[PDB]
Design a protein around this nucleic acid. Structure first.
Lengths: 338, 48, 264
RNA sequence: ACGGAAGGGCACCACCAGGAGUGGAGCCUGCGGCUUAAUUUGGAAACUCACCAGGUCCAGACACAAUAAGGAUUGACAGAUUGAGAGCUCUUUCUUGAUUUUGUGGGUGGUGGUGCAUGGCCGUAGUUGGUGGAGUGAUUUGUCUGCU
């Protein structure tokens, strides 16, 4: 809640789209060099921007209770199938598929499908094309939080932002998905760092809400390119990893400051904060630097800009000083693509 | 030659403490099930 | 002086357990080389030691070969405060100290936000040049905390109104804030007659086990009585006990005459 | 090597015998902490001051475009404003001689880091290595029991 006007959550221990493309290439270009470093407007209070953020010692070590009173989650969060061990799901379901298959393969079947007269006008004859019908499994219709594993295509080098829509063909079905990207790592709390753009080569993980696969099909990722050559500009390929609701992506925002005068306590602040209101929120949260020290800026003036910091360690020079705040990202729901 | 059953990872001997990403193969000609190492880094994403 | 509030926070995950790793071996191996930490990756232990050796929680001996360590007076301090925080207590230190001679009164924040008193036990406060490391500051001051700690718990269990010990681990005893004011600094109170009637009878309370206080003179207890600095007491087996009787009483027969003007 | 055994000595930064004391009262000062715009930092009213609040003023090498000898620009004795022998500016107009100016591109400077790169300067009775002899070797005798 907004209970506590101190104390951030810590738990103490056609050409316009091309200009949008140049904007995406610029934001990924700078987001490569200084990643996750939000640049505060000094005119505007850094409290309202950073209300929902929660500061952490380390992503990997801490523990979140899985959801929260969020309200930027989809409200259909409880309208999701929760899975235990995905291995102990799908072998069971394939086990029931063996034991209850009425139709042995190589058998001729006239098939009776409930079907609208709305959709007869897209049907062709089964000679000049390939009306072919794929079965499904038990829970393969219904929504849960999934994870893919993107990797870029071989020729491809254009940047891909993190919530632009991408058509995903995993197995047979094909959905329109605005994903959530994260690098692949194995934290025990299953809490991983959100990506704002996607890496040059090393295989990452997307995440979105889509109905489940029980077979871990390969997937091709593309955006439709209707104006272009053949009807698709392919982006990537990948593999349906699993259906994890607990895959918690954390949006990292880095506040960055400069030191002025050394040798006294340690260090002061130039660009980090603006007001003495910025003290009370962000100074139980520790602080890092670039082979250096830890924790606890202490108050001073803010009337021009300056916050006399404390630290733990030795070396300080014409350097930078950076803290962090973490926020969960939430999946977006998806639609089919026809 | 064999069929991969699943992909694993290790918690090996001291001092080198890590997760080394082996797999489970079942051989064809015996039906025996033997663990197997994947070489040069990456390449766990090559197998399924 | 010897104690420090600065670096408690900046240790990492393995540290507390790595700094613990020397402690389990300490009871058997009191000289601990580097790998002896491992079993109990190749990043983990020395980045802890880089803390522990440079943050002075583990002493270092310099040799070309792998070096044997023996855990440092500073290192138990946070190890204590680790299990301290882990029982539950001590969210933060308070701004009111609290600096005594042999013991450290620390306003300290328990869970629920309870300001309370922490007492670190180690003698002769200044770190001293004359000490042999590993025992005198740790281990002498280590045992002696529980020696006192289970007295008050046993003495508070008697029912006499006194402080109750909250927590003890590794030469740190925590107990109630016990607000009140000592009679050493006493400023004003109107009613002595039952005050001292309690006092002189508070003595036979102190004497109900066949004991005599010997600190019952001034600078001990406060208007709630709130009494402190217990350890000096004398047994009935203790041979000279009868001499100390009139010592205690008459010294507080002494006080009142000057300040608050009463006589038994 | 072992904060390990034991044993020898030394010492008003130890004890004995005392002596004068502190700690108890008030106040001065120093440290921490607390508060504060800041209480610089581990014999302070200005200066010191490194801190805080506002305030003016300056920067800009050099390559290039343009402009500028039909003014680029320096300084200039009041008065206003500003807290001020601020031409910062201004009401202006004396003089300057390209020393430079607007814009682009574009670089030097650091008493910045290294005494942990090299010189030179300043202050301030026990160690050993040799030749032996012993042992393939780690090593050892030398560096030693007795008397004064």
């Amino acid at each position: 809640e907004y209970d506590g006007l101190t104390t951030a959550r810590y738990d103490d221990h056609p050409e316009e789209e091309e200009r949008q493309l140049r904007e995406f290439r610029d934001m990924e270009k700078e987001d490569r060099e200084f990643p996750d470093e939000i640049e505060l407007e000094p005119s505007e209070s850094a409290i309202e921007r950073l209300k929902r953020y929660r500061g952490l010692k380390n992503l990997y070590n801490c523990d979140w209770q899985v959801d929260e009173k969020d309200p930027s989650s989809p409200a259909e969060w409880k309208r999701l199938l929760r899975i235990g061990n995905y291995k102990n799901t799908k072998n069971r379901i394939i086990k029931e598929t063996k034991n209850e298959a009425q139709a042995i393969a190589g058998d001729r079947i006239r098939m009776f499908i409930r079907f609208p007269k709305f959709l007869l006008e897209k049907i062709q004859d089964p000679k000049q094309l390939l009306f072919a019908v794929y079965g499904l499994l038990l829970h393969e219709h219904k929504n849960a939080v999934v994870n893919f594993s993107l990797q870029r295509w071989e020729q491809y080098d254009k940047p891909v932002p993190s919530q632009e829509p991408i058509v995903v063909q995993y197995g047979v079905r094909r959905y329109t998905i605005q994903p959530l990207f994260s690098q692949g790592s194995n934290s025990p709390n299953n809490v991983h760092k959100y990506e704002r753009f996607l890496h040059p080569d090393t295989v990452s993980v997307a995440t979105c809400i889509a109905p489940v696969d029980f077979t871990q099909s390969p997937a091709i990722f593309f955006k439709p390119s209707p104006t272009d050559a053949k009807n698709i500009e392919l982006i990537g390929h990948g593999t349906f990893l699993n259906a994890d609701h607990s895959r918690i992506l954390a949006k990292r925002a880095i506040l960055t400051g400069h030191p002025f005068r050394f040798h006294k306590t340690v260090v002061t602040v130039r660009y980090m904060f603006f007001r003495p209101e910025d003290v009370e929120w962000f100074k139980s949260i520790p602080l890092f630097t670039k082979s250096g020290r830890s924790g606890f800026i202490k108050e001073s003036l803010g009337t021009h800009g300056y916050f006399k910091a404390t630290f733990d360690g030795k070396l300080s020079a014409q350097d930078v000083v950076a803290m962090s705040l973490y926020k969960r990202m939430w999946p977006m729901p998806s639609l089919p693509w026809n | 030659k064999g069929i991969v059953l699943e992909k694993l990872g290790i918690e090996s001997k001291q001092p080198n403490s890590a997760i080394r990403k082996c797999v489970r193969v079942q051989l064809i000609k015996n039906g025996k099930k033997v663990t197997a190492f994947v070489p040069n880094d990456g390449c766990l994403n090559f197998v399924d | 002086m010897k104690l420090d509030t600065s670096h408690m926070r900046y240790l990492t995950t393995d540290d507390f357990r790595v700094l613990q790793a020397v402690e389990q071996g300490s009871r058997s191996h009191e000289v601990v080389p580097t790998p002896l930490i491992h079993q109990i990756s190749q990043s983990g232990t020395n980045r802890a030691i880089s803390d522990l050796a440079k943050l002075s929680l583990i002493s270092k001996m310099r040799n070309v070969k792998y070096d044997g360590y023996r855990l440092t007076y500073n290192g138990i301090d946070y190890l204590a405060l680790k299990t301290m925080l882990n029982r539950d207590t001590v969210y933060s230190v308070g701004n009111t100290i609290g600096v005594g001679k042999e013991s450290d009164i620390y306003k300290v924040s328990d869970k629920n936000g309870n300001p309370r008193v922490m007492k670190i036990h180690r003698l002769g406060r200044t770190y001293l040049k004359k000490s042999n490391q590993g025992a005198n500051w740790m281990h002498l001051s280590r045992l002696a905390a529980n020696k006192e700690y289970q007295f008050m718990s046993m003495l508070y269990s008697k029912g006499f109104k006194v402080p109750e010990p909250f927590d003890n681990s590794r030469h740190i005893v925590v107990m109630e804030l016990i607000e009140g004011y000592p009679m050493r600094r006493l400023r004003k109170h109107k009613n002595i007659p039952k005050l001292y009637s309690d006092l002189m009878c508070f003595i036979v309370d102190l004497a109900n086990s066949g004991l005599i206080h010997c600190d019952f003179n001034e600078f001990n207890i406060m208007i709630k009585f709130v009494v402190i600095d217990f350890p000096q007491c004398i047994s009935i087996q203790h041979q000279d006990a009868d001499y100390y009787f009139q010592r205690d009483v008459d010294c507080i027969r002494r006080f009142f005459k000057k300040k608050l003007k009463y006589e038994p």
